[PDB]
Short mmCIF file of C-alpha atoms in Angstrom, two decimals:
data_model
loop_
_atom_site.label_atom_id
_atom_site.label_comp_id
_atom_site.label_asym_id
_atom_site.label_seq_id
_atom_site.Cartn_x
_atom_site.Cartn_y
_atom_site.Cartn_z
CA UNK A 1 109.13 108.26 98.88
CA UNK A 2 108.01 105.79 101.49
CA UNK A 3 108.52 107.92 104.55
CA UNK A 4 105.28 108.41 106.50
CA UNK A 5 103.14 111.52 106.55
CA UNK A 6 100.36 112.93 108.66
CA UNK A 7 97.82 115.33 107.22
CA UNK A 8 96.23 118.30 108.95
CA UNK A 9 93.63 120.40 107.24
CA UNK A 10 94.53 124.01 107.76
CA UNK A 11 91.30 125.99 107.84
CA UNK A 12 89.90 123.69 110.54
CA UNK A 13 92.79 122.11 112.38
CA UNK A 14 91.71 118.49 112.09
CA UNK A 15 93.49 115.33 111.02
CA UNK A 16 92.35 113.07 108.19
CA UNK A 17 92.01 109.89 110.24
CA UNK A 18 91.23 106.67 108.38
CA UNK A 19 88.50 105.08 110.44
CA UNK A 20 87.72 102.49 107.75
CA UNK A 21 85.49 100.82 110.33
CA UNK A 22 83.25 103.70 109.23
CA UNK A 23 85.05 105.97 106.67
CA UNK A 24 88.01 108.27 106.01
CA UNK A 25 87.12 110.95 108.56
CA UNK A 26 88.48 114.18 110.01
CA UNK A 27 89.36 114.04 113.70
CA UNK A 28 91.17 116.24 116.20
CA UNK A 29 94.65 116.37 117.72
CA UNK A 30 93.97 114.37 120.88
CA UNK A 31 92.14 111.62 119.01
CA UNK A 32 94.54 111.22 116.09
CA UNK A 33 97.24 108.57 116.44
CA UNK A 34 99.88 107.17 114.11
CA UNK A 35 98.01 104.25 112.52
CA UNK A 36 94.77 106.23 112.34
CA UNK A 37 96.11 108.74 109.84
CA UNK A 38 99.71 108.15 108.64
CA UNK A 39 100.15 108.02 104.85
CA UNK A 40 103.00 107.71 102.38
CA UNK A 41 103.44 108.65 98.73
CA UNK A 42 104.63 106.49 95.87
CA UNK A 43 105.14 106.96 92.16
CA UNK A 44 102.43 104.48 91.20
CA UNK A 45 99.84 102.11 92.64
CA UNK A 46 102.69 99.69 93.47
CA UNK A 47 103.88 98.47 96.86
CA UNK A 48 107.41 97.11 96.35
CA UNK A 49 114.26 107.28 103.67
CA UNK A 50 113.66 107.83 107.37
CA UNK A 51 117.04 108.06 109.14
CA UNK A 52 118.99 110.89 107.53
CA UNK A 53 120.35 114.14 108.86
CA UNK A 54 120.48 117.56 107.32
CA UNK A 55 117.57 118.76 105.26
CA UNK A 56 117.87 115.59 103.14
CA UNK A 57 117.73 115.01 99.41
CA UNK A 58 114.86 116.50 97.42
CA UNK A 59 113.10 113.51 95.93
CA UNK A 60 109.80 114.91 94.70
CA UNK A 61 108.84 118.07 92.82
CA UNK A 62 105.63 120.06 93.13
CA UNK A 63 104.41 120.37 89.56
CA UNK A 64 105.96 117.33 87.91
CA UNK A 65 104.96 114.19 89.86
CA UNK A 66 101.84 112.09 90.20
CA UNK A 67 101.78 110.70 93.73
CA UNK A 68 99.50 108.04 95.18
CA UNK A 69 98.44 107.64 98.80
CA UNK A 70 99.18 104.27 100.40
CA UNK A 71 98.14 103.98 104.03
CA UNK A 72 100.42 102.22 106.49
CA UNK A 73 97.91 100.53 108.77
CA UNK A 74 95.50 99.08 106.21
CA UNK A 75 97.33 99.27 102.88
CA UNK A 76 94.40 101.16 101.39
CA UNK A 77 94.65 103.49 98.42
CA UNK A 78 92.59 106.64 98.11
CA UNK A 79 89.85 106.47 95.50
CA UNK A 80 86.85 108.44 94.34
CA UNK A 81 83.25 107.56 93.72
CA UNK A 82 82.02 107.77 90.13
CA UNK A 83 78.56 120.20 89.76
CA UNK B 1 123.37 157.18 130.38
CA UNK B 2 126.29 154.76 130.69
CA UNK B 3 124.45 151.65 129.57
CA UNK B 4 124.88 148.90 132.15
CA UNK B 5 124.61 151.40 135.02
CA UNK B 6 120.97 151.72 134.00
CA UNK B 7 120.48 147.99 134.08
CA UNK B 8 122.08 147.51 137.51
CA UNK B 9 119.97 150.42 138.74
CA UNK B 10 116.92 148.70 137.26
CA UNK B 11 117.84 145.52 139.13
CA UNK B 12 117.93 147.73 142.21
CA UNK B 13 114.45 148.98 141.31
CA UNK B 14 113.43 145.31 141.05
CA UNK B 15 114.06 144.56 144.72
CA UNK B 16 112.35 146.17 147.74
CA UNK B 17 109.97 148.18 145.50
CA UNK B 18 109.59 151.28 147.72
CA UNK B 19 107.73 149.33 150.43
CA UNK B 20 110.76 150.52 152.38
CA UNK B 21 108.52 153.47 153.31
CA UNK B 22 106.68 151.17 155.71
CA UNK B 23 110.02 150.69 157.40
CA UNK B 24 110.56 154.44 157.15
CA UNK B 25 107.46 155.36 159.11
CA UNK B 26 107.37 152.30 161.41
CA UNK B 27 110.84 152.74 162.94
CA UNK B 28 110.77 156.49 163.60
CA UNK B 29 108.39 156.44 166.56
CA UNK B 30 109.18 153.35 168.67
CA UNK C 1 152.87 115.05 118.27
CA UNK C 2 152.51 111.36 118.92
CA UNK C 3 154.84 110.45 121.82
CA UNK C 4 155.18 106.71 121.41
CA UNK C 5 157.71 105.36 123.91
CA UNK C 6 155.92 106.81 126.94
CA UNK C 7 152.59 105.67 128.32
CA UNK C 8 149.96 108.31 127.55
CA UNK C 9 150.34 110.80 124.76
CA UNK C 10 149.92 114.57 125.00
CA UNK C 11 149.58 116.16 121.57
CA UNK C 12 151.32 119.39 122.44
CA UNK C 13 150.75 121.02 119.07
CA UNK C 14 146.99 121.23 119.46
CA UNK C 15 147.66 122.80 122.84
CA UNK C 16 149.84 125.52 121.37
CA UNK C 17 147.16 126.08 118.72
CA UNK C 18 144.71 126.59 121.56
CA UNK C 19 146.96 129.08 123.31
CA UNK C 20 147.27 130.99 120.06
CA UNK C 21 143.48 130.96 119.77
CA UNK C 22 143.25 132.48 123.25
CA UNK C 23 145.67 135.27 122.41
CA UNK C 24 143.85 135.86 119.11
CA UNK C 25 140.52 136.30 120.86
CA UNK C 26 141.91 138.66 123.45
CA UNK C 27 143.61 140.82 120.82
CA UNK C 28 140.25 140.92 119.06
CA UNK C 29 138.58 142.02 122.27
CA UNK C 30 141.20 144.72 122.69
CA UNK C 31 140.26 145.92 119.21
CA UNK C 32 136.62 146.55 120.11
CA UNK C 33 137.55 148.62 123.14
CA UNK C 34 139.52 150.94 120.90
CA UNK C 35 137.20 150.46 117.96
CA UNK C 36 135.70 153.91 118.39
CA UNK C 37 137.94 156.31 120.28
CA UNK C 38 140.71 156.00 117.70
CA UNK C 39 143.43 158.03 119.47
CA UNK C 40 145.27 155.46 121.51
CA UNK C 41 146.99 156.26 124.81
CA UNK C 42 150.58 155.54 125.72
CA UNK C 43 149.39 152.70 127.94
CA UNK C 44 147.38 151.10 125.15
CA UNK C 45 150.32 151.18 122.74
CA UNK C 46 152.78 150.00 125.39
CA UNK C 47 150.55 147.08 126.32
CA UNK C 48 149.63 146.33 122.75
CA UNK C 49 153.10 145.99 121.24
CA UNK C 50 153.94 143.88 124.28
CA UNK C 51 151.20 141.52 123.14
CA UNK C 52 152.35 141.79 119.52
CA UNK C 53 155.74 140.29 120.35
CA UNK C 54 154.11 137.30 122.01
CA UNK C 55 151.92 136.65 118.99
CA UNK C 56 155.00 136.98 116.80
CA UNK C 57 156.77 134.41 118.93
CA UNK C 58 153.98 131.85 118.87
CA UNK C 59 153.81 132.15 115.11
CA UNK C 60 157.56 131.55 114.89
CA UNK C 61 157.00 128.37 116.85
CA UNK C 62 154.20 127.38 114.55
CA UNK C 63 156.56 127.86 111.66
CA UNK C 64 159.37 125.84 113.08
CA UNK C 65 157.11 123.01 114.11
CA UNK C 66 155.82 122.58 110.58
CA UNK C 67 158.65 124.11 108.57
CA UNK C 68 160.21 120.77 107.90
CA UNK C 69 157.68 119.01 105.71
CA UNK C 70 156.92 116.24 108.21
CA UNK C 71 153.54 115.48 106.77
CA UNK C 72 151.85 114.14 109.91
CA UNK C 73 152.40 117.49 111.58
CA UNK C 74 150.65 119.13 108.63
CA UNK C 75 147.78 116.65 108.75
CA UNK C 76 147.25 116.85 112.50
CA UNK C 77 147.31 120.62 112.59
CA UNK C 78 145.17 120.85 109.45
CA UNK C 79 142.07 119.58 111.26
CA UNK C 80 142.43 121.83 114.28
CA UNK C 81 140.88 125.22 114.83
CA UNK C 82 143.71 127.19 113.30
CA UNK C 83 141.68 128.61 110.42
CA UNK C 84 139.30 130.49 112.68
CA UNK C 85 142.22 132.07 114.52
CA UNK C 86 143.68 133.14 111.19
CA UNK C 87 140.32 134.61 110.14
CA UNK C 88 140.13 136.57 113.37
CA UNK C 89 143.64 137.88 112.85
CA UNK C 90 142.75 139.09 109.36
CA UNK C 91 139.68 140.81 110.77
CA UNK C 92 141.99 142.56 113.20
CA UNK C 93 144.40 143.28 110.39
CA UNK C 94 142.23 145.15 107.92
CA UNK C 95 140.47 147.62 110.21
CA UNK C 96 143.55 147.91 112.38
CA UNK C 97 145.83 148.94 109.53
CA UNK C 98 143.11 151.30 108.33
CA UNK C 99 142.58 153.27 111.51
CA UNK C 100 146.19 153.05 112.66
CA UNK C 101 147.61 154.48 109.45
CA UNK C 102 146.14 157.91 109.95
CA UNK C 103 148.36 159.63 112.54
CA UNK C 104 151.94 160.68 113.00
CA UNK C 105 152.29 159.06 116.42
CA UNK C 106 151.03 155.64 115.29
CA UNK C 107 154.10 154.90 113.17
CA UNK C 108 155.72 152.55 115.65
CA UNK C 109 152.83 150.25 116.44
CA UNK C 110 152.10 150.10 112.72
CA UNK C 111 155.70 148.99 112.14
CA UNK C 112 155.17 146.26 114.69
CA UNK C 113 151.88 145.11 113.23
CA UNK C 114 153.29 144.94 109.72
CA UNK C 115 156.12 142.87 111.17
CA UNK C 116 153.60 140.50 112.73
CA UNK C 117 151.73 140.44 109.43
CA UNK C 118 154.92 139.32 107.72
CA UNK C 119 155.67 136.47 110.10
CA UNK C 120 152.02 135.37 110.08
CA UNK C 121 151.92 134.98 106.32
CA UNK C 122 155.35 133.33 106.58
CA UNK C 123 153.72 130.73 108.81
CA UNK C 124 150.69 130.19 106.61
CA UNK C 125 152.69 129.99 103.39
CA UNK C 126 155.24 127.70 104.98
CA UNK C 127 152.39 125.45 106.02
CA UNK C 128 151.09 125.26 102.47
CA UNK C 129 153.91 123.47 100.72
CA UNK C 130 153.06 119.76 100.47
CA UNK C 131 150.36 120.39 97.89
CA UNK C 132 149.84 118.43 94.74
CA UNK C 133 147.44 120.39 92.56
CA UNK C 134 144.06 120.38 94.23
CA UNK C 135 145.38 119.44 97.62
CA UNK C 136 143.25 119.23 100.74
CA UNK C 137 145.23 121.94 102.55
CA UNK C 138 145.01 124.17 99.49
CA UNK C 139 141.26 123.65 99.50
CA UNK C 140 141.16 124.62 103.18
CA UNK C 141 143.05 127.81 102.52
CA UNK C 142 140.83 128.61 99.55
CA UNK C 143 137.87 128.14 101.88
CA UNK C 144 139.18 130.47 104.56
CA UNK C 145 139.79 133.07 101.88
CA UNK C 146 136.20 132.54 100.76
CA UNK C 147 134.67 132.93 104.21
CA UNK C 148 136.51 136.19 104.93
CA UNK C 149 136.99 137.77 101.51
CA UNK C 150 135.89 141.21 102.68
CA UNK C 151 138.68 142.37 104.98
CA UNK C 152 141.33 140.89 102.72
CA UNK C 153 140.01 143.17 99.99
CA UNK C 154 140.71 146.03 102.40
CA UNK C 155 144.27 144.91 102.94
CA UNK C 156 144.92 144.56 99.20
CA UNK C 157 143.58 148.06 98.61
CA UNK C 158 145.75 149.26 101.50
CA UNK C 159 148.75 147.89 99.66
CA UNK C 160 147.58 149.55 96.45
CA UNK C 161 147.26 152.99 98.00
CA UNK C 162 150.93 153.10 98.93
CA UNK C 163 152.44 151.10 96.08
CA UNK C 164 150.84 153.17 93.34
CA UNK C 165 151.75 156.19 95.48
CA UNK C 166 155.44 155.61 94.85
CA UNK C 167 154.67 154.87 91.20
CA UNK C 168 152.81 158.14 90.58
CA UNK C 169 155.34 159.97 92.74
CA UNK C 170 158.37 158.67 90.87
CA UNK C 171 157.27 160.12 87.52
CA UNK C 172 158.22 163.74 86.89
CA UNK C 173 154.76 164.85 85.83
CA UNK C 174 154.35 166.68 89.15
CA UNK C 175 157.66 165.89 90.90
CA UNK C 176 159.12 168.11 88.20
CA UNK C 177 156.31 170.68 88.56
CA UNK C 178 157.72 171.99 91.73
CA UNK C 179 160.87 173.89 90.74
CA UNK C 180 162.77 172.67 93.80
CA UNK C 181 162.01 168.99 94.29
CA UNK C 182 163.30 169.10 97.87
CA UNK C 183 160.35 167.50 99.62
CA UNK C 184 158.26 170.63 99.09
CA UNK C 185 154.91 169.94 97.47
CA UNK C 186 151.91 171.88 98.72
CA UNK C 187 148.65 170.26 99.73
CA UNK C 188 146.77 171.83 96.87
CA UNK C 189 149.78 171.03 94.66
CA UNK C 190 149.73 167.45 95.82
CA UNK C 191 145.96 167.36 95.42
CA UNK C 192 146.07 168.50 91.81
CA UNK C 193 148.96 166.07 91.45
CA UNK C 194 147.35 162.93 92.78
CA UNK C 195 143.94 163.40 91.22
CA UNK C 196 145.40 164.09 87.78
CA UNK C 197 147.63 161.04 87.87
CA UNK C 198 144.23 159.30 87.42
CA UNK C 199 144.55 156.06 89.32
CA UNK C 200 142.67 157.15 92.43
CA UNK C 201 139.08 157.29 93.47
CA UNK C 202 138.65 160.66 95.11
CA UNK C 203 137.55 159.09 98.39
CA UNK C 204 140.98 157.53 98.52
CA UNK C 205 142.59 160.83 97.63
CA UNK C 206 140.79 162.11 100.71
CA UNK C 207 142.16 159.09 102.57
CA UNK C 208 145.72 159.88 101.56
CA UNK C 209 145.36 163.61 102.22
CA UNK C 210 143.82 162.84 105.61
CA UNK C 211 146.73 160.49 106.18
CA UNK C 212 149.70 162.28 104.79
CA UNK C 213 151.50 164.86 106.95
CA UNK C 214 149.75 168.23 107.12
CA UNK C 215 153.32 169.53 107.35
CA UNK C 216 153.10 172.95 108.97
CA UNK C 217 152.00 175.06 106.02
CA UNK C 218 150.71 172.76 103.29
CA UNK C 219 153.81 170.84 102.21
CA UNK C 220 154.90 167.18 102.49
CA UNK C 221 158.22 165.45 101.91
CA UNK C 222 158.95 162.99 99.15
CA UNK C 223 161.69 161.10 100.98
CA UNK C 224 160.12 161.17 104.42
CA UNK C 225 156.56 160.48 103.42
CA UNK C 226 156.53 157.74 100.79
CA UNK C 227 160.15 156.49 100.76
CA UNK C 228 159.63 156.53 104.49
CA UNK C 229 156.57 154.38 103.99
CA UNK C 230 157.18 152.39 100.82
CA UNK C 231 159.53 149.80 102.34
CA UNK C 232 157.17 147.67 104.53
CA UNK C 233 154.29 147.74 102.06
CA UNK C 234 156.78 146.33 99.58
CA UNK C 235 158.16 143.71 101.96
CA UNK C 236 154.96 142.20 103.35
CA UNK C 237 153.09 142.60 100.07
CA UNK C 238 155.80 140.52 98.45
CA UNK C 239 154.84 137.59 100.65
CA UNK C 240 151.17 138.26 100.07
CA UNK C 241 151.73 138.18 96.33
CA UNK D 1 126.92 119.00 112.85
CA UNK D 2 127.12 122.51 114.23
CA UNK D 3 124.46 125.19 114.42
CA UNK D 4 125.11 127.56 111.56
CA UNK D 5 123.36 130.92 111.27
CA UNK D 6 119.99 131.26 109.50
CA UNK D 7 118.62 127.79 110.09
CA UNK D 8 115.65 126.57 112.04
CA UNK D 9 115.80 125.05 115.52
CA UNK D 10 113.84 124.74 118.77
CA UNK D 11 114.32 124.85 122.53
CA UNK D 12 113.31 121.98 124.74
CA UNK D 13 113.26 120.50 128.25
CA UNK D 14 111.98 117.49 130.19
CA UNK D 15 109.50 118.07 133.00
CA UNK D 16 109.96 115.67 135.91
CA UNK D 17 107.05 115.45 138.38
CA UNK D 18 106.82 111.94 139.93
CA UNK D 19 108.63 109.96 137.21
CA UNK D 20 107.65 112.11 134.24
CA UNK D 21 109.72 112.46 131.14
CA UNK D 22 107.33 115.19 130.11
CA UNK D 23 109.39 116.53 127.19
CA UNK D 24 108.03 120.01 126.74
CA UNK D 25 109.45 122.27 124.04
CA UNK D 26 109.05 125.98 123.43
CA UNK D 27 106.21 127.58 121.50
CA UNK D 28 104.71 131.03 121.18
CA UNK D 29 101.86 132.33 119.08
CA UNK D 30 102.11 136.05 118.91
CA UNK D 31 98.98 137.37 117.22
CA UNK D 32 97.13 138.93 120.11
CA UNK D 33 98.93 136.57 122.52
CA UNK D 34 102.37 137.85 123.39
CA UNK D 35 103.23 135.50 126.24
CA UNK D 36 105.09 132.33 125.34
CA UNK D 37 103.74 128.94 126.34
CA UNK D 38 104.36 125.22 126.29
CA UNK D 39 104.10 122.24 123.97
CA UNK D 40 104.65 118.67 125.15
CA UNK D 41 106.54 116.30 122.85
CA UNK D 42 106.54 113.18 125.03
CA UNK D 43 103.00 112.40 123.84
CA UNK D 44 104.04 112.13 120.21
CA UNK D 45 102.19 108.98 119.15
CA UNK D 46 99.44 110.18 121.49
CA UNK D 47 99.15 113.67 119.99
CA UNK D 48 100.89 114.96 116.87
CA UNK D 49 102.32 118.24 118.17
CA UNK D 50 101.44 121.55 116.55
CA UNK D 51 105.01 122.16 115.48
CA UNK D 52 104.52 125.11 113.10
CA UNK D 53 104.26 127.54 116.01
CA UNK D 54 107.30 126.18 117.88
CA UNK D 55 110.28 126.75 115.60
CA UNK D 56 112.61 129.74 115.45
CA UNK D 57 115.17 131.27 113.09
CA UNK D 58 118.54 132.74 114.06
CA UNK D 59 119.07 136.11 112.42
CA UNK D 60 122.39 137.21 113.79
CA UNK D 61 125.22 136.09 116.05
CA UNK D 62 127.88 138.47 117.31
CA UNK D 63 130.22 138.77 120.23
CA UNK D 64 129.38 140.75 123.35
CA UNK D 65 131.67 143.61 122.38
CA UNK D 66 130.20 143.41 118.89
CA UNK D 67 126.82 143.80 120.55
CA UNK D 68 128.22 146.94 122.17
CA UNK D 69 129.36 148.00 118.70
CA UNK D 70 125.81 147.65 117.44
CA UNK D 71 124.71 149.51 120.57
CA UNK D 72 126.88 152.46 119.64
CA UNK D 73 123.51 153.68 118.40
CA UNK D 74 127.87 135.33 105.99
CA UNK D 75 126.59 132.12 107.59
CA UNK D 76 128.92 132.17 110.55
CA UNK D 77 128.81 129.52 113.26
CA UNK D 78 127.91 130.52 116.80
CA UNK D 79 130.16 129.89 119.79
CA UNK D 80 129.56 129.79 123.54
CA UNK D 81 129.72 133.46 124.42
CA UNK D 82 127.87 134.93 121.49
CA UNK D 83 124.78 137.11 121.61
CA UNK D 84 122.01 135.95 119.28
CA UNK D 85 118.60 136.86 117.97
CA UNK D 86 115.56 134.58 117.85
CA UNK D 87 112.77 135.52 115.51
CA UNK D 88 109.65 133.43 115.61
CA UNK D 89 109.82 131.51 112.37
CA UNK D 90 106.08 131.80 111.76
CA UNK D 91 104.87 135.15 113.08
CA UNK D 92 107.92 137.24 112.25
CA UNK D 93 108.06 138.67 115.75
CA UNK D 94 111.35 138.58 117.61
CA UNK D 95 111.62 136.80 120.94
CA UNK D 96 112.49 139.09 123.82
CA UNK D 97 112.25 139.57 127.58
CA UNK D 98 109.28 141.52 128.88
CA UNK D 99 109.52 143.79 131.91
CA UNK D 100 106.38 142.34 133.53
CA UNK D 101 105.69 139.44 135.86
CA UNK D 102 103.01 136.91 136.79
CA UNK D 103 108.64 137.14 143.08
CA UNK D 104 110.73 138.94 140.45
CA UNK D 105 110.60 136.47 137.57
CA UNK D 106 110.21 138.42 134.33
CA UNK D 107 107.86 137.33 131.58
CA UNK D 108 108.91 136.25 128.11
CA UNK D 109 107.18 137.84 125.14
CA UNK D 110 107.39 138.50 121.43
CA UNK D 111 107.97 141.94 119.99
CA UNK D 112 108.77 143.84 116.80
CA UNK D 113 111.72 146.19 117.06
CA UNK D 114 115.20 144.70 117.12
CA UNK D 115 116.54 147.72 119.00
CA UNK D 116 117.38 147.44 122.67
CA UNK D 117 118.75 144.58 124.72
CA UNK D 118 115.41 142.80 125.02
CA UNK D 119 115.83 140.79 121.82
CA UNK D 120 119.28 139.47 122.68
CA UNK D 121 120.49 136.36 124.46
CA UNK D 122 123.92 135.14 125.44
CA UNK D 123 124.78 131.46 125.46
CA UNK D 124 126.56 129.66 128.25
CA UNK D 125 127.94 126.11 128.35
CA UNK D 126 126.23 123.45 130.40
CA UNK D 127 129.50 121.50 130.53
CA UNK D 128 132.60 121.47 132.63
CA UNK D 129 134.20 119.84 129.57
CA UNK D 130 133.02 122.04 126.73
CA UNK D 131 133.59 125.68 127.56
CA UNK D 132 133.90 129.18 126.14
CA UNK D 133 135.11 129.98 122.65
CA UNK D 134 134.48 126.61 121.03
CA UNK D 135 131.58 125.60 118.84
CA UNK D 136 128.10 124.42 119.69
CA UNK D 137 127.47 120.94 118.34
CA UNK D 138 124.03 119.61 117.49
CA UNK D 139 122.14 118.75 120.64
CA UNK D 140 124.34 120.52 123.16
CA UNK D 141 122.65 121.37 126.46
CA UNK D 142 122.91 125.10 127.04
CA UNK D 143 121.79 127.99 129.19
CA UNK D 144 120.41 131.24 127.79
CA UNK D 145 120.84 134.56 129.57
CA UNK D 146 119.24 137.83 128.55
CA UNK D 147 121.32 140.90 127.97
CA UNK D 148 119.00 143.41 129.62
CA UNK D 149 117.29 141.49 132.41
CA UNK D 150 120.32 139.18 132.87
CA UNK D 151 118.08 136.30 133.89
CA UNK D 152 118.11 132.65 132.98
CA UNK D 153 115.55 131.17 130.60
CA UNK D 154 113.80 129.56 133.51
CA UNK D 155 111.22 126.78 133.49
CA UNK D 156 108.90 127.36 136.44
CA UNK D 157 106.08 125.31 137.93
CA UNK D 158 104.33 125.29 134.61
CA UNK D 159 105.57 128.74 133.68
CA UNK D 160 108.31 129.86 131.33
CA UNK D 161 109.92 133.08 132.46
CA UNK D 162 113.16 134.97 132.96
CA UNK D 163 114.47 134.29 136.46
CA UNK D 164 117.63 134.11 138.56
CA UNK D 165 117.60 130.31 138.64
CA UNK D 166 119.26 128.34 135.89
CA UNK D 167 117.40 125.94 133.62
CA UNK D 168 118.89 123.57 131.06
CA UNK D 169 117.82 123.97 127.44
CA UNK D 170 118.53 121.60 124.58
CA UNK D 171 118.52 122.61 120.92
CA UNK D 172 117.43 120.35 118.08
CA UNK D 173 117.55 121.12 114.35
CA UNK D 174 114.41 121.32 112.23
CA UNK D 175 115.38 122.43 108.73
CA UNK D 176 117.90 124.29 106.62
CA UNK D 177 115.98 123.34 97.15
CA UNK D 178 113.50 125.17 94.96
CA UNK D 179 110.51 123.54 93.32
CA UNK D 180 110.92 120.55 95.60
CA UNK D 181 108.77 118.99 98.31
CA UNK D 182 110.13 120.08 101.69
CA UNK D 183 108.46 118.96 104.89
CA UNK D 184 106.42 120.99 107.32
CA UNK D 185 104.72 122.71 104.40
CA UNK D 186 101.11 123.67 103.64
CA UNK D 187 99.92 122.97 100.11
CA UNK D 188 97.05 122.07 97.81
CA UNK D 189 96.25 118.52 96.74
CA UNK D 190 95.16 118.65 93.10
CA UNK D 191 93.27 115.95 91.22
CA UNK D 192 93.35 116.89 87.53
#
């Protein structure tokens, strides 16, 4: 939890870059930077590591966790809009 | 086949790749 | 080890560990050169026993450095690269005792290697004495048995196939079946002997019959096959146990 | 700490052309493209590097005479003077030394069959201090020499090829439990 993550969609090869000046968009390798796309995951909608060696300690499962995306650069949380 | 003898001989193939024959014909009549 | 009253220290014991590691590696490289041809020349034996004595001598020094329980010697040598050298020696030991113990001419070098085996386990056992219960050094030696379990299984089976030999020999269930008992037991007689003692997988009966003597008709001695052989497998195997 | 068998590492350099720390690493695709190629890692915040097609997995380390023993036809730790394999961690192809060129600098390709001396590489120390027989720590600079072609893993100008001129190569670790999120992975992002 809390370490940053970039996201690449696989079937295209683009990066989910948060251009909140317009919208959460999908841009390429050369255009994507750190603050444009880097996300973390937390247990909840709250806001209250990075330097280890080895393969680390397994924090998060696959099936049994509900993670929430908190962007580094803007603090934004992913949401939906209300076949 | 003695193993490394092949690979040294291949290194010998790798250098002067039979363009020696230009030297073969060019010398013999000067 | 620590050399206080002078100016700059030279920890000589790690240096002699490193020389042992060198000789270990070169014995291991001599193994691979005879890993396939399996009938060793006079020059190979003459050179090889000449190396065996040197390895015997450096293990006697590694005993009598650490044989007194001066614990700092144990600690300082515990974190060096001894364990890998020991692992490499065991990997020599298993396959070497296997393919050596199959001829009549290889008796002498096998004597020498069992001797080296004895002083090597003398060194390792004499190292492991300042234990408590779950000591660090005991954990290290557990771990080197873990990482090279395979070949040590071969050496334990090699001890079995000449300890149980004297056991199944010493009973008069076939040693009485020859009327003479004067070292005359035929190869088919010894085959129907050793299979019907019923402690032997038949591959290892083939191993012993391939090993034994092939003594000029089909026979084999009692005294000068197993009582010949049963002494060193007792002596080293004692220390192993 | 050390580089144990059957983990996941890379190979890497720095390209210096007029004050460049152009940190290129090694990548190869396979898949209708046998020749290996480059991947810069200096431009990290600039470009997130496509790192899935760069990594490799050690299958097997042995000694040189043990390589002869295999050529008669268990997570050990490698030492300077071992012969190793390098499978491409993605494609499953093994990294080898091709007998073609693009002088006499041989090309570097991927292949399938582990037979023959193409797939195999010795290691040599890039240190007067650290030398033969001892371990390879994390991040040790090292030279790789093929068994068959007996050429160094050369970085040319920018080609990557087997040549008679040495080239430094650094190694960095990448990875080494079940049901647990482990990085570098492709997955689905459910909603409910």
